[PDB]
């Protein structure tokens, strides 16, 4: 048997329903959400690190002169200094007082650290959705499995085919552009590749981290050696990853809205609480049993105990009964006014049974139904004393659910009062133009 | 790629009044302090806790 509903998209807070088949008694059916989460396809674009500036030995040529060719390196350096005459520990190298040339060279390498720390720069497009999905049904007990949320794919838990349907809101809390650093992520519109600037966040950037082409984007300018010594002396723009390492500012994981939870592998936002999710399980027709093979309870009463409106159960009623065939029976609330803690109760031939709900109606009208019937419950609940609390609220607020009856009386005489001031003052009007009308008549 | 033993600051005292978190930090050493609302705007808060 099909059963289809609509879940909120709630994580940690049980669904709960009765599977009404014609002819068979009602099957308790309750589906919980382990954990959602959205998983977008990314496209690496680029990895960006610290960059290491590799200096080989440069040629000092004595009594003569050299000259730079270009090379393949990235952000290569060359330049002749002329009119050096440098020592060494065996005194001084050339002989010439000034015509000897020292040629330096210098171009930037991915330093060692950039095969561990290094910033991964991902295109974000819409992905998949996938959900674990945790299910108990009548008498069988919980049994989990992986699902897709997309609406088509069905996936097979405890002998019950459920498909969950697509998420309500398309919601993403990835940009079209992310940084992936570590276990952070970082809504961040990089630079294309080849166009990072000096000191910036792409200063150096790579397609991949064992490629060997790299972009280099630094002012590495070499600077002349200083008189009599052999060196190859170079100013160049900080690195821009240490920079962005400073000022990364707060990541995804930290701004995503409605509570997400951001994973790297793969990436993915979890428990994201948008919207609701469109169900469809099939029951094992086993699981169903006829009418008149189930009790039948009758003569209900319910009288509420205890009430106050916290997140938690702060509900307690107590059901008073007649039955027949002693036995357990399932008790459902099919209106969102109450949540019912209790899932099912056993039944005597006669007696009394009880039961928890949470509620965030100040005076709290349910109705209650216990297998083939159902009972009315009303009460007063009290405010809750804890100002902040560590769990989810198990309910749901309506707009109406604060309004006491004492507010809805003032409510009343205010517009019954003020419906009346002009219903009397337009009567008073036409009564007087008949009897003017007569006047003349 | 390593595992390091990183500080953990003092834990807070929490004072609860009406749709009012107060916290009392009392950290050791610069410590930050992030918050965020679960709701459609987080409304996303980051400031470093140098002292009391
Ligand atoms: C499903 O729920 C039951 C009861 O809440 C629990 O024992 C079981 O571990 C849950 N499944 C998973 C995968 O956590």
Known sequence: YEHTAVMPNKVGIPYKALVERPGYAPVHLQIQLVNTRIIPSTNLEYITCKYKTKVPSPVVKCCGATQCTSKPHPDYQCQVFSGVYPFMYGGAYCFCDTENTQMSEAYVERSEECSIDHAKAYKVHTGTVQAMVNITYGSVSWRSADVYVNGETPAKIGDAKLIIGPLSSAWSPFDNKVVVYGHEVYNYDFPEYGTGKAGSFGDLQSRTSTSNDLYANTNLKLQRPQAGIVHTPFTQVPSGFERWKKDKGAPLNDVAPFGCSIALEPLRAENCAVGSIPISIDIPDAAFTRISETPTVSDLECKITECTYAFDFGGIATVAYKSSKAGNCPIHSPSGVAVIKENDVTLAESGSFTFHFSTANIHPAFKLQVCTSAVTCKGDCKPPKDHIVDYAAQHTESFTSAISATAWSWIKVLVGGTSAFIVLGLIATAVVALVLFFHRH | ?52
């Open chain 2, 1 to 52: 790629k390593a595992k390091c033993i990183a500080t953990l600051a003092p834990e807070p005292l929490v004072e609860h009044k009406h749709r009012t978190l107060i916290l009392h930090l009392h950290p050791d050493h610069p410590t930050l302090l992030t918050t965020r609302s679960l709701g459609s705007d987080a409304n996303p808060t980051r400031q470093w806790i140098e002292r009391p």
